[PDB]
Amino acid sequence: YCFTSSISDLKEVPRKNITLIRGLGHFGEVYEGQVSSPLQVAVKTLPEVCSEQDELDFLMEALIISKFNHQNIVRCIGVSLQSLPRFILLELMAGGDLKSFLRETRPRPPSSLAMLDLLHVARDIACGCQYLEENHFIHRDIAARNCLLTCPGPGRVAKIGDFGMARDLPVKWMPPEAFMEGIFTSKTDTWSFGVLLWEIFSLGYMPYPSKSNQEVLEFVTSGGRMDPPKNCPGPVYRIMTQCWQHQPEDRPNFAIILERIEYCTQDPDVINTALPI
Numbered sequence: 001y002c003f004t005s006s007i008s009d010l011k012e013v014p015r016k017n018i019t020l021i022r023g024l025g026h027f028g029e030v031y032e033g034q035v036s037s038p039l040q041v042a043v044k045t046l047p048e049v050c051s052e053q054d055e056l057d058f059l060m061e062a063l064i065i066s067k068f069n070h071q072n073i074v075r076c077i078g079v080s081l082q083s084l085p086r087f088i089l090l091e092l093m094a095g096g097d098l099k100s101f102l103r104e105t106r107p108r109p110p111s112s113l114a115m116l117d118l119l120h121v122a123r124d125i126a127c128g129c130q131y132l133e134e135n136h137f138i139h140r141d142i143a144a145r146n147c148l149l150t151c152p153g154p155g156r157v158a159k160i161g162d163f164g165m166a167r168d169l170p171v172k173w174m175p176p177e178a179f180m181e182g183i184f185t186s187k188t189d190t191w192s193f194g195v196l197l198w199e200i201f202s203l204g205y206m207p208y209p210s211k212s213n214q215e216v217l218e219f220v221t222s223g224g225r226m227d228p229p230k231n232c233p234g235p236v237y238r239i240m241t242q243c244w245q246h247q248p249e250d251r252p253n254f255a256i257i258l259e260r261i262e263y264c265t266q267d268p269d270v271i272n273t274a275l276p277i
Ligand SMILES: Cc1cc(-n2cc(C(=O)N3CCOCC3)c3ccc(N[C@@H](C)c4ccc(F)cn4)nc32)n[nH]1
Pocket: 024, 025, 026, 030, 032, 042, 074, 090, 091, 092, 093, 094, 095, 096, 097, 145, 146, 147, 148, 160, 161, 162
């Protein structure tokens, strides 16, 4: 991997200074841990019962995440490969994953989130995606499940937190030239971000709600697109549909998406819109 970089360059942190407090999620388990005054981290694990391709998949991920340097991308604190099971030390973000956060902070009788908060989450991810595109990296799995938040209160920062699909399928998140032709460019991530925008403004709904995979395949290929989420404003939905243009030569880059997300923030008719319950 190059971004130029070898396993040489990672920070090998000894297993003696690592222990795992609690489990967080699961391919392969992921826990919360401590290191060293104590440092709080997230620990991704390679199960010791594994094959050869699993090994060069696990480290692959380690060098890729370690080569990034961006505030909207999960930091790699350290690495523990010389002790079985091999670890990847990652930035711990107390806000949890994005899909859970929106479904759990969904307003209910209360005034949990306003629309300005979700525009910030979308721009946080859009700025991280701009960093990937500028450095010619294609993610291939821009979804709400792979996004994390530093904290739950105001001032939260969203960050892309996983690179599982970027090894070297999420039908509902991929453009036609992806699932039918196997082509992947920076415009493939533009389509997925548009689906992510829909996840954000629907507050965690599953895209194409009652459609299975092949239904989405034939629906998207024939020109069909999703309806706006409940109470979604005009300028926001137009960003989703511009991301879902059939020809990738007409979808916008992440510099243009960032500008349009900025303008909706500068629109009182957008940020004063009430979220449903
Ligand atoms: C790399 C990383 C993960 C992470 N993390 C923080 C959780 C959390 O809920 N916390 C609240 C209580 O305090 C502790 C923090 C959390 C929950 C599930 C999870 N699942 C894994 C598979 C995952 C990985 C990447 C991704 F984008 C989504 N999910 N990861 C979680 N922080 N940093």
